[PDB]
Design a protein around this ligand. Sequence first.
Ligand SMILES: Nc1ncnc2c1ncn2[C@@H]1O[C@H](COP(=O)(O)OP(=O)(O)OP(=O)(O)O)[C@@H](O)[C@H]1O
Ligand SMILES: Nc1ncnc2c1ncn2[C@@H]1O[C@H](COP(=O)(O)OP(=O)(O)OP(=O)(O)O)[C@@H](O)[C@H]1O
Ligand SMILES: [Mg+2]
Ligand SMILES: [Mg+2]
Lengths: 8, 8, 343, 343, 69
Amino acid sequence: TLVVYEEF
Amino acid sequence: TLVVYEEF
Amino acid sequence: STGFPLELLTRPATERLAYFENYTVAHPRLKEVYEILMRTIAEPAGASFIFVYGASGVGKTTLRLRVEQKLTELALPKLESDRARVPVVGIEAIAPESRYFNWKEYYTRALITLEEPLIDHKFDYGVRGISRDNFGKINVESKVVAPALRRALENALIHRHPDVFFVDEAQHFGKVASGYKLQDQLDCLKSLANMTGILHCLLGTYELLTFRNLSGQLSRRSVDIHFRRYCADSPEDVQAFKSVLLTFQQHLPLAETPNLVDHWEYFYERTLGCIGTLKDWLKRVLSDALDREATTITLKDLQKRALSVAQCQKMFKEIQEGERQLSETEADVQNLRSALGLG
Amino acid sequence: STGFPLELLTRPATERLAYFENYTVAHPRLKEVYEILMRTIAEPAGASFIFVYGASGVGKTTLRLRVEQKLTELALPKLESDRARVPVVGIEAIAPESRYFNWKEYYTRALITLEEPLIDHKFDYGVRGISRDNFGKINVESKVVAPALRRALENALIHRHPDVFFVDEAQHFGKVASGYKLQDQLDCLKSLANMTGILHCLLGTYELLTFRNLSGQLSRRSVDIHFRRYCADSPEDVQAFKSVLLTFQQHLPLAETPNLVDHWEYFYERTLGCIGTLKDWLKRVLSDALDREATTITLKDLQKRALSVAQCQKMFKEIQEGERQLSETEADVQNLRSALGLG
Amino acid sequence: PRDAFAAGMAIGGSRVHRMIPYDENFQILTLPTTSEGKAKVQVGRGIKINYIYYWSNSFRDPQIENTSV
Ligand SMILES: Nc1ncnc2c1ncn2[C@@H]1O[C@H](COP(=O)(O)OP(=O)(O)OP(=O)(O)O)[C@@H](O)[C@H]1O
Ligand SMILES: Nc1ncnc2c1ncn2[C@@H]1O[C@H](COP(=O)(O)OP(=O)(O)OP(=O)(O)O)[C@@H](O)[C@H]1O
Ligand SMILES: [Mg+2]
Ligand SMILES: [Mg+2]
């Protein structure tokens, strides 16, 4: 499983 | 016995 | 949404490139150093320096322009009632043109950058040769001696009352003359930071690794932040690298999404786990593709913009040099306990 | 009672943090040091220097602050009638940005900090280039050479006669060139102090030990004080560390009091027995708790805000090299007796 | 040989004055040196012996700095 991050 | 100090 | 906006496909190439430019990822290292840095600026308890070591490409500069903007937003409600205050101050150290670093230029740059407020503020310095002109630009007479410039700087920093003074390219301080002590420079910085009451956050590469724990006073009043490149040995770092690669590939504005995760070993080889270098590579490839107006990014456009092998050899040499220094080991804790009469 | 008042239970985080930060404890080491410093200040009896050696973070500056505060009530009733007199003055040495120390800057800073009692008082320093502007800020010209500034400072110090001249961070006097000797710098300071008849108290780390016992004059002329830490090799220091931890625990403004007595060992690992370092760590962890909104304190927040291993290593190395030179043994007493012939 | 040694040093005297005590002084006296005999104390680096640099605490004193020892 590959996690998805958000903008910073 | 544990001592309790005052404020400088 | 979780991908790049659809309307970007409708817009011309420059808009897609600009959107790629303004996209900043949030990897666990970045958020961890974000939390640590926010906490230490909010509460230093006497510490005067904040060292942030890192590679060439992990996001130091960025790290700040984010911390600068966030602290500005935080202080805006505090600036709503208290005036003549600057939230943060940030300058970049200038590499000298001669064998020795220039402190006069440093003080001049700091006084120029810090003092660009609304003209209504009319704070007066202690030096006649430094003057705010009618146009609003601070002019420093070339004859003003350094100590002079520094007195001023201290007066301005104690009147403005900021929370942190950022200095990029801190290793440029190390361009001393042959025989000049590398502790006297940190001593000058500490003297500046000890009476103004402003934290000094030094940002630099592993060369700044030559400015650590020189003295007990320079050690107790120092906070060491390290910003590590992603390591292939750690499985969780591998998962994080794959996740950031997938995120960058997904937000890569194009009609077709090539599988950048598949070439993860090539990416690691040509970026050394440094996300900034990965973003530079992706930017070059995207510019190439959008010039050719194609929708698919191949390995050929990845190679025609790829860094040379000797470059990666040199950066990895530097990174190993840096990472050997700040290693922590249980043996260190136990021998420090033993030498203290604690074991 | 023995801890913080219960009213502080209904306030914001800022009030609790301010109360804790403005809280200074009186450990027996600090009590003895304060008593002997006060007695020395009352009657130096021909003493020109009071060097204050100690580990970085032991409590030198807070002791100096309390000393000036005390001097301000032993004077205020006598300052209602008398005037043109200050109880105590202070200054911190500037670390030079050049290879050599700037004595002219020291003189200018001392004259600036000494002479601001009231605009009504006027006195001619006898040096052309020193005045008071419309804003009440003592200004000195850039061309007043060091001897003229020294004469002006001498006249001002004779006129003002403070009970002591505090020079904090005195080790910065040692920033000299190849041929320059430390005895010359200390002799200039001694000449100033003796000519103005004002006792000088130099405070700093163990680097100031390079200014100890240089010549027979600089030597007689001196009451050396030592702000020693608490050492784990003696039961009394360990018990006092535990007791100060208990009083800190009872004076941490939290609904539930954490148990810091059992965790003293790791404490002493990262604090080296220095109460100032312990206080900064405790205030940092309290700010963390009040930001996270945690009722009590756990070990994880203590390990998120403790010092690094290498920092404590260098600190303890400096502390060892310091205490090695400030110990009295009967062997030295008998050696001096035999050399004199008293034995 | 031990008997001859003892008899000779009894007849010819022990000559305690010419005794060399095996202590630290003799330890540093037996040690060799370079061709010049002395080296300069460069500020922040120390003394250059056999391609390497050596530093000591006392070298921080400017009296012996930039001089031959
Ligand atoms: N977390 C991130 N997400 C997206 N882009 C990033 C991130 N961190 C760094 N970058 C990109 O890295 C590029 C160059 O690196 P950056 O400006 O962050 O400095 P740095 O590599 O830390 O510093 P230096 O080159 O001085 O060692 C910038 O274009 C920036 O957008
Ligand atoms: N007895 C004490 N009780 C409470 N806080 C203390 C005490 N002693 C020191 N502190 C706190 O420790 C912090 C730093 O200590 P301090 O300013 O006294 O340093 P110092 O011993 O003069 O060291 P340095 O040479 O590194 O400047 C301050 O926040 C100060 O309030
Ligand atoms: Mg940068
Ligand atoms: Mg101090």
